[PDB]
Amino acid sequence: IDPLLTLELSGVKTYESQEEAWGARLYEWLNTYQGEVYGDPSWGNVLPQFKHEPTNLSHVQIAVEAMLLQKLTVDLPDIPISGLSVAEGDAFDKLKISIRIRDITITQDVVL
Amino acid sequence: MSKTTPTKDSIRAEFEELVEKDSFWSKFVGSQFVSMLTLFITQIVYRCFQYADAALAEGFISTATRRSS
Amino acid sequence: ARGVKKNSDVGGWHYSPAGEERAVIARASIQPLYPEDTPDEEAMVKGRLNKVSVGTSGQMIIDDALTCCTQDNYLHFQHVPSLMNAISRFFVQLARQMKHSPDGITAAGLTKGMTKLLDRFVASGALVAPRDPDADGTEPYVLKVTQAEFDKWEVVWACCPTGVARRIQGVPLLIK
Amino acid sequence: SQYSIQQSLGNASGVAVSPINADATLSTGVALNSSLWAGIGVFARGKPFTVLAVTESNYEDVLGEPLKPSSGSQFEPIRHVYEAIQQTSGYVVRAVPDDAKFPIIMFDESGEPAYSALPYGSEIELDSGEAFAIYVDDGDPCISPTRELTIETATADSAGNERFLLKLTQTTSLGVVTTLETHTVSLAEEAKDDMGRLCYLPTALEARSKYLRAVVNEELISTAKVTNKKSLAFTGGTNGDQSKISTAAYLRAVKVLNNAPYMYTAVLGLGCYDNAAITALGKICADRLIDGFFDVKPTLTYAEALPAVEDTGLLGTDYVSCSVYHYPFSCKDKWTQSRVVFGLSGVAYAAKARGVKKNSDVGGWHYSPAGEERAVIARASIQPLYPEDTPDEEAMVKGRLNKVSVGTSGQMIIDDALTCCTQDNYLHFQHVPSLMNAISRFFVQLARQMKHSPDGITAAGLTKGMTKLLDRFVASGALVAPRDPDADGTEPYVLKVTQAEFDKWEVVWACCPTGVARRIQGVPLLIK
Amino acid sequence: EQLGVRFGDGLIGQIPPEGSTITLKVWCTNGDITLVAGQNLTPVDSAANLANLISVKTTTPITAGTDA
Amino acid sequence: MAPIAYGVYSQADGVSPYLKVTLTNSQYQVTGYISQGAAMNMAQNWEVWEGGTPPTFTLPVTFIALNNPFIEVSGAIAALTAMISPELKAANVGGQIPERVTLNIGRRINITDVAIQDLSFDLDAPRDSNGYFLKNTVNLQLTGSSIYNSSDIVRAFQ
Amino acid sequence: MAPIAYGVYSQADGVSPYLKVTLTNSQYQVTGYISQGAAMNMAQNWEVWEGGTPPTFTLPVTFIALNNPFIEVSGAIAALTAMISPELKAANVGGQIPERVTLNIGRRINITDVAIQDLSFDLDAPRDSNGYFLKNTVNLQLTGSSIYNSSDIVRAFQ
Amino acid sequence: TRQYPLSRYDDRNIADPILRAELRKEVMLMCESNDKNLTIYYVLPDEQYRPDLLAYRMWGIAELRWVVTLAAGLEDESQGMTVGKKLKLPPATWIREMIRHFQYDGQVIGTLSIA
């Protein structure tokens, strides 16, 4: 026996465990970039836009986060967004984006 | 390999020994979903071969019976 | 130049020469010399060169923000050494402006100039809180001025700059 | 470019993602710093006989994955921590029997490796040979996953001292290799990096390294050299048996928890059934003036569980601030969907904590652990152990245990709000003794704050502090008017302070608390 | 939802004597079973002391079980 | 990265980022200050409750040409009038729209789709040597793109 | 027991319970202060007296973030907008309603069924370090569920 | 319920390969004609695998993929097309109209003189 994972394989069959299921769906949304998926190249995370901006240009960071959230929402209306948090790290080299749909608090380490 | 008409069982075979000779399922055994996936792609390829046969028929005036061709 | 002079008061040199905010070129009919050959990122960054690629919109993008500093120290970034260069240049300008002046007011003038320079810096956002508050707390600047003789005012100044995350990494994780 | 994704980070800059494997875990959160709990448990990983400030960020990581419930009686602690960490953090202590051994790899003068395993706590020494050695301390037997190390040379220091880079990684059964650290160090005692980072081997191991500790001969370090060794795996590690744990280990854990100078507002049983351990935890709770969440063995029916409380021996005025529970049911495993039985202690503590900290200024401990405001559990597929057997309410309340039932919405509800106080006095309730505990703790804090101060202002300061504390109490509503105005009127508080000598300010304070109607009764009447 | 047996009489079977025992050994399983190469087993009971002496390694994949 | 922005967009103003109003679209960004007189209203229609109405917003914003009027006032008002003005003849009849912009408030309350239905201000404020305005108070009237549900609204704040 | 509540819900505020306004439904509770400007009106239609009209209420309430703004202001306004916003697309087409809340006044005068028909306030009040509001004055407009009779109304007070 | 899957975009809505052939014939005629109502844009390096990627960015529809494929004359997306080649795209509604005419009353096609 060998179990499985959720990253583009399977979390659960359908939405039984609601919130973790939506978190999984958003996970395979965010783990893909532009030009790496057929049909809708714009589908997925838009790191190619919000890659490596200066960490202290709060206006551009808020603009990019707003646009990304609105487009992912209009992309997947099933899952609206509750909480997005941007938290710097110990060094200037680490940022964290924490997305929670009211409970999930799943976080990813980004770099600018 | 050839343009001779195959059989769905033959395609299922070639797929299954290809799978077993491939090491990735060896590291990941227990994929009984690939079974009916192979079935479905087998009918897909069968329809594709029918389309190819239609292409041969239309590629020759003797074989093509269409007014347009 | 355009990035630094987007800001109007003093300018911001803390900008990274990567990303399509600046690194958009797209001249015409780009042709790779060696399509099969691909750059090696780790050897490239060790060699301190700058490598390029294509963005999603087809523009030509420089995907590097490092100088030619052999050592991996914080000088090996690009914007930060420019930050020290700019602050040093401004300090030189102000020191020359106040130069050749009778004593007794020189210390006060230099202190006021540096304080207002710090104000402009914190407005610009380049001056940021220290990474480790255990040693210096959250106060990111220090200055002293001493005298040797009739001349030789020795001024010493240390500051905490910012960063644009040159070390690039990420890891998303699962929940099942 | 943005299209490339890496796995480990060196000099190249890129964005990495999780590999395609069979299993994965997660743990994320921020510390509470509000109210803490402590308890002894046996888990995966973690140093034995060691305290660990566990939060939502490390609950699944440093404690390892949950073990199989049918794999011994070690599933009660893992279920308790799983149910508790989702809302609150703690200071959980873990120990294992001496049977467990950790592995170590020795590099001789030439750098040749030798594998060994030693019981946890044993100290390794270096003789004429055995130039140096590195032993793992995280507690993992290096079997799932395995620890591998790759060592080679690197650039020298600014002083020209030769330096070598070594990287540690964990490799799973399926072959996923996730690195933990990659550091450049040197044999030089004064090895300073261009960042000013020290590259000395033992200092680096103790400071930056977190899973491995190294012992080096101080006389052979100068003559020592380096070699190129790739993916060196530890062997001989063993977790030992955890089903049977010595009372000696129990008492060692008890005393180290006692000596631990970390704040925790409550103590949790974590499913332990050792009578001596339970009694020791009870006396810890008593002499530290906190709350305890003990539990009885669920496997026994009511008729013998009722005497089980004094069989354990925790009945008495000393164990007045603690509560003891019983869970005569079996729910469904969250993973193995099997009949699993574990206590309600962690969820009870969580309910109490969230209820008290609903209030923001100081909190309210006058809350009853009954009703579906807090007592809602409903884990999965509840199965009564003895459907025909029913609890006896009067014998239960006399025995000072806590009984459970099902609410209308199907949730599991604890229908009791009493402590383990034998006497029927007002201490036999649950919230009220917690009220005295909280007020006493606050008084202790303020007294220590004002402590060591010159006289003449001490009385004024203590009076002002107590008056403002009374103000916060009446705002919280805990301080209420006396039941009988014949004696003290409606004024519910009194305070005096006196002096004995140069020291010994004797302060005396009496208050009127409230109640939540533990005595439960009712009678509607007719009119025709 | 119960399965069982019937003890017949006459020429249709014979009744076991009163007090005689009837042992029912049921071969049970979980249905379809997936066994991938690359795992180690934990023999128990009489082989519990043999578990450290004998290692069981999954090398030949075992699958193609049936269900209801 | 982001397209051109106007107003107090950079941190050089040295003002609290929270108190900044921000509007952003695919090609334009305007940043300003949360001025007094702001209001919002949501309601419904009935006669028997018939239905609801989309959200409404009345936002007055004050803009100051502290250092660079061209980017802080002139460019700002130009972007604002571009956004409110329906561009329905941009040689792209296959998709012309009056365009909608996204609003950020307090850096934490975001309205993904809102329509700038009305704009007004005064031009009588004093100017500079070149002539660009020093101060203005532009009042804006905004509408939601639809009658948003409770599940849509309550779970959109931080 | 009761579901989540917002505003000055606990007694820790140390304020008279009588002067508190309370709204409660199956899943949300909001508690506030009886601010000046409150009014109510009942009337009828005629031309020959034809009929009556349901009760109407105009309640301005002031909210103060004394200690915890997250629960006292942000959560309060979120619950309020959730209640007023008609949730008619909650995947339960067999029963979706705009939802009505019950009102308690002076701890003795109860309106079992009342509809929050209109809400408004201002967001220009000063904030905290995080940015949650310190103060607000939210005006509410409320309607009775029907044209209540005298026997329905007079016998409902304390 | 009443449901049928279809989409009114496919140029191959016409089942005749020969008819589809002259359709692509005149669209090629127009594309490599230098008409001003055509787009003026070069090639992108990543278009080798995804020629329709440009169609998605400037139109949001992949229906132009066969258009660009015939414009570039590609044997396979495995091979690449030179970056900088002159590429021309007509307004989509124009193609929609011509195909609409051709599949309702695409009879005279060439020139109608008089009824």
mmCIF file of C-alpha atoms in Angstrom, chain F:
data_model
loop_
_atom_site.group_PDB
_atom_site.id
_atom_site.type_symbol
_atom_site.label_atom_id
_atom_site.label_comp_id
_atom_site.label_asym_id
_atom_site.label_seq_id
_atom_site.Cartn_x
_atom_site.Cartn_y
_atom_site.Cartn_z
ATOM 1 C CA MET F 1 4.315 45.510 -12.239
ATOM 2 C CA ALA F 2 1.332 47.793 -11.704
ATOM 3 C CA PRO F 3 0.365 50.473 -14.252
ATOM 4 C CA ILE F 4 0.649 54.216 -13.694
ATOM 5 C CA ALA F 5 -0.695 55.628 -10.433
ATOM 6 C CA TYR F 6 -1.607 59.144 -9.343
ATOM 7 C CA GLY F 7 -2.192 60.980 -6.092
ATOM 8 C CA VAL F 8 -0.249 60.175 -2.915
ATOM 9 C CA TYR F 9 0.888 56.856 -4.334
ATOM 10 C CA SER F 10 4.406 56.663 -2.928
ATOM 11 C CA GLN F 11 5.315 56.409 0.739
ATOM 12 C CA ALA F 12 7.342 59.631 0.426
ATOM 13 C CA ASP F 13 4.272 61.486 1.695
ATOM 14 C CA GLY F 14 5.063 59.938 5.076
ATOM 15 C CA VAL F 15 1.392 59.349 5.864
ATOM 16 C CA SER F 16 -0.311 56.323 7.384
ATOM 17 C CA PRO F 17 -1.033 53.796 4.608
ATOM 18 C CA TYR F 18 -4.277 52.715 6.270
ATOM 19 C CA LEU F 19 -5.991 56.089 5.808
ATOM 20 C CA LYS F 20 -5.408 55.972 2.041
ATOM 21 C CA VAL F 21 -8.194 55.347 -0.476
ATOM 22 C CA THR F 22 -7.142 53.357 -3.531
ATOM 23 C CA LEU F 23 -8.792 52.562 -6.851
ATOM 24 C CA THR F 24 -7.152 50.210 -9.324
ATOM 25 C CA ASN F 25 -7.896 48.823 -12.764
ATOM 26 C CA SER F 26 -5.923 47.102 -15.505
ATOM 27 C CA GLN F 27 -4.175 50.313 -16.549
ATOM 28 C CA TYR F 28 -4.707 53.056 -13.951
ATOM 29 C CA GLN F 29 -4.418 53.591 -10.212
ATOM 30 C CA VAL F 30 -5.493 56.555 -8.085
ATOM 31 C CA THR F 31 -4.627 56.954 -4.405
ATOM 32 C CA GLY F 32 -6.065 59.521 -2.018
ATOM 33 C CA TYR F 33 -7.140 60.389 1.523
ATOM 34 C CA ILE F 34 -10.286 59.279 3.364
ATOM 35 C CA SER F 35 -12.003 62.651 3.795
ATOM 36 C CA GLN F 36 -15.000 63.514 5.958
ATOM 37 C CA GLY F 37 -18.508 63.236 4.568
ATOM 38 C CA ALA F 38 -18.219 59.657 3.329
ATOM 39 C CA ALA F 39 -21.384 57.585 3.418
ATOM 40 C CA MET F 40 -22.903 54.399 2.054
ATOM 41 C CA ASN F 41 -26.373 52.943 1.780
ATOM 42 C CA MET F 42 -28.019 49.627 0.951
ATOM 43 C CA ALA F 43 -31.756 49.055 0.722
ATOM 44 C CA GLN F 44 -34.501 47.047 -0.937
ATOM 45 C CA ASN F 45 -37.915 47.315 -2.566
ATOM 46 C CA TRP F 46 -41.250 46.041 -1.282
ATOM 47 C CA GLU F 47 -44.972 46.790 -1.390
ATOM 48 C CA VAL F 48 -44.842 41.637 0.540
ATOM 49 C CA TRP F 49 -41.088 42.044 0.110
ATOM 50 C CA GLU F 50 -40.150 42.158 -3.570
ATOM 51 C CA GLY F 51 -36.372 42.371 -3.817
ATOM 52 C CA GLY F 52 -33.205 44.280 -3.021
ATOM 53 C CA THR F 53 -30.925 46.957 -4.419
ATOM 54 C CA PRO F 54 -27.188 47.069 -5.147
ATOM 55 C CA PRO F 55 -24.842 48.842 -2.719
ATOM 56 C CA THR F 56 -24.324 52.592 -2.991
ATOM 57 C CA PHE F 57 -21.379 54.757 -1.976
ATOM 58 C CA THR F 58 -20.788 58.503 -1.600
ATOM 59 C CA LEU F 59 -17.078 59.189 -1.165
ATOM 60 C CA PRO F 60 -15.606 62.686 -0.940
ATOM 61 C CA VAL F 61 -11.815 62.672 -1.278
ATOM 62 C CA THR F 62 -9.395 65.551 -0.790
ATOM 63 C CA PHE F 63 -6.243 65.756 -2.896
ATOM 64 C CA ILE F 64 -3.181 67.867 -2.072
ATOM 65 C CA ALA F 65 -0.407 68.808 -4.505
ATOM 66 C CA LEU F 66 2.280 68.620 -1.845
ATOM 67 C CA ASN F 67 5.287 68.277 -4.154
ATOM 68 C CA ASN F 68 4.333 67.235 -7.722
ATOM 69 C CA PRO F 69 0.986 68.667 -8.847
ATOM 70 C CA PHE F 70 1.226 67.140 -12.320
ATOM 71 C CA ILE F 71 1.100 63.608 -10.923
ATOM 72 C CA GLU F 72 -0.940 64.347 -7.796
ATOM 73 C CA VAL F 73 -3.813 66.539 -9.065
ATOM 74 C CA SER F 74 -3.861 66.936 -12.840
ATOM 75 C CA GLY F 75 -3.018 63.324 -13.628
ATOM 76 C CA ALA F 76 -5.334 62.167 -10.854
ATOM 77 C CA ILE F 77 -8.356 64.068 -12.155
ATOM 78 C CA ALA F 78 -7.515 62.984 -15.703
ATOM 79 C CA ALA F 79 -7.496 59.323 -14.677
ATOM 80 C CA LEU F 80 -10.723 59.821 -12.736
ATOM 81 C CA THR F 81 -12.547 61.373 -15.679
ATOM 82 C CA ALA F 82 -11.155 58.671 -17.959
ATOM 83 C CA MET F 83 -12.555 56.000 -15.660
ATOM 84 C CA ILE F 84 -15.979 57.572 -15.224
ATOM 85 C CA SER F 85 -16.256 58.471 -18.908
ATOM 86 C CA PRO F 86 -17.638 55.476 -20.832
ATOM 87 C CA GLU F 87 -15.130 54.521 -23.532
ATOM 88 C CA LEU F 88 -17.534 52.941 -26.024
ATOM 89 C CA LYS F 89 -15.858 54.057 -29.265
ATOM 90 C CA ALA F 90 -12.295 52.761 -28.876
ATOM 91 C CA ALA F 91 -12.211 51.072 -32.310
ATOM 92 C CA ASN F 92 -12.999 47.762 -30.575
ATOM 93 C CA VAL F 93 -16.788 47.440 -31.018
ATOM 94 C CA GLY F 94 -16.343 43.793 -30.078
ATOM 95 C CA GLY F 95 -16.258 44.468 -26.357
ATOM 96 C CA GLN F 96 -16.400 48.204 -25.646
ATOM 97 C CA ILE F 97 -17.453 48.929 -22.058
ATOM 98 C CA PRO F 98 -17.766 51.975 -19.811
ATOM 99 C CA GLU F 99 -15.196 50.135 -17.633
ATOM 100 C CA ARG F 100 -15.323 49.406 -13.896
ATOM 101 C CA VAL F 101 -12.606 49.856 -11.284
ATOM 102 C CA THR F 102 -11.793 48.026 -8.042
ATOM 103 C CA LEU F 103 -11.790 49.880 -4.721
ATOM 104 C CA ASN F 104 -9.554 49.301 -1.706
ATOM 105 C CA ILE F 105 -10.404 50.911 1.642
ATOM 106 C CA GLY F 106 -8.280 50.852 4.772
ATOM 107 C CA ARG F 107 -6.037 48.425 2.887
ATOM 108 C CA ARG F 108 -8.361 45.623 4.060
ATOM 109 C CA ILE F 109 -11.910 46.224 2.747
ATOM 110 C CA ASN F 110 -12.020 45.507 -0.982
ATOM 111 C CA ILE F 111 -14.831 45.981 -3.489
ATOM 112 C CA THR F 112 -13.840 43.989 -6.561
ATOM 113 C CA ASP F 113 -16.393 45.521 -8.943
ATOM 114 C CA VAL F 114 -17.839 48.996 -8.439
ATOM 115 C CA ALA F 115 -19.020 51.564 -10.983
ATOM 116 C CA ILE F 116 -18.125 55.259 -10.736
ATOM 117 C CA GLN F 117 -21.540 56.596 -11.643
ATOM 118 C CA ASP F 118 -20.994 60.227 -10.660
ATOM 119 C CA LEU F 119 -18.153 62.699 -10.119
ATOM 120 C CA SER F 120 -17.968 66.350 -9.164
ATOM 121 C CA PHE F 121 -15.590 68.895 -7.649
ATOM 122 C CA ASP F 122 -14.555 72.550 -7.749
ATOM 123 C CA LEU F 123 -11.725 74.132 -9.739
ATOM 124 C CA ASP F 124 -11.626 77.437 -7.829
ATOM 125 C CA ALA F 125 -8.851 76.324 -5.472
ATOM 126 C CA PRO F 126 -5.525 78.188 -5.686
ATOM 127 C CA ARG F 127 -2.843 77.064 -8.106
ATOM 128 C CA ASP F 128 0.944 77.037 -8.582
ATOM 129 C CA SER F 129 3.318 79.148 -10.656
ATOM 130 C CA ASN F 130 2.753 76.845 -13.629
ATOM 131 C CA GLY F 131 -0.946 76.832 -12.724
ATOM 132 C CA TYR F 132 -1.662 73.294 -11.502
ATOM 133 C CA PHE F 133 -4.122 73.020 -8.626
ATOM 134 C CA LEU F 134 -2.942 72.814 -5.042
ATOM 135 C CA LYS F 135 -6.079 71.387 -3.475
ATOM 136 C CA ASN F 136 -9.347 69.818 -4.425
ATOM 137 C CA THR F 137 -12.281 67.956 -2.907
ATOM 138 C CA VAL F 138 -13.768 65.547 -5.436
ATOM 139 C CA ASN F 139 -16.986 63.838 -4.430
ATOM 140 C CA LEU F 140 -17.804 60.492 -6.020
ATOM 141 C CA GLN F 141 -20.934 58.374 -6.348
ATOM 142 C CA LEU F 142 -20.388 54.626 -6.687
ATOM 143 C CA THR F 143 -22.640 51.625 -7.293
ATOM 144 C CA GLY F 144 -22.211 47.906 -6.801
ATOM 145 C CA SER F 145 -22.254 45.684 -9.851
ATOM 146 C CA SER F 146 -25.219 43.699 -8.504
ATOM 147 C CA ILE F 147 -27.478 43.187 -5.500
ATOM 148 C CA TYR F 148 -24.949 41.308 -3.395
ATOM 149 C CA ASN F 149 -26.096 38.599 -0.997
ATOM 150 C CA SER F 150 -25.280 38.392 2.696
ATOM 151 C CA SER F 151 -22.892 35.524 2.003
ATOM 152 C CA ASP F 152 -21.334 37.780 -0.622
ATOM 153 C CA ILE F 153 -20.956 40.806 1.634
ATOM 154 C CA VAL F 154 -20.301 39.790 5.239
ATOM 155 C CA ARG F 155 -17.429 37.468 4.305
ATOM 156 C CA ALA F 156 -15.626 40.141 2.272
ATOM 157 C CA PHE F 157 -14.279 42.232 5.173
ATOM 158 C CA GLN F 158 -11.119 41.908 7.245
#
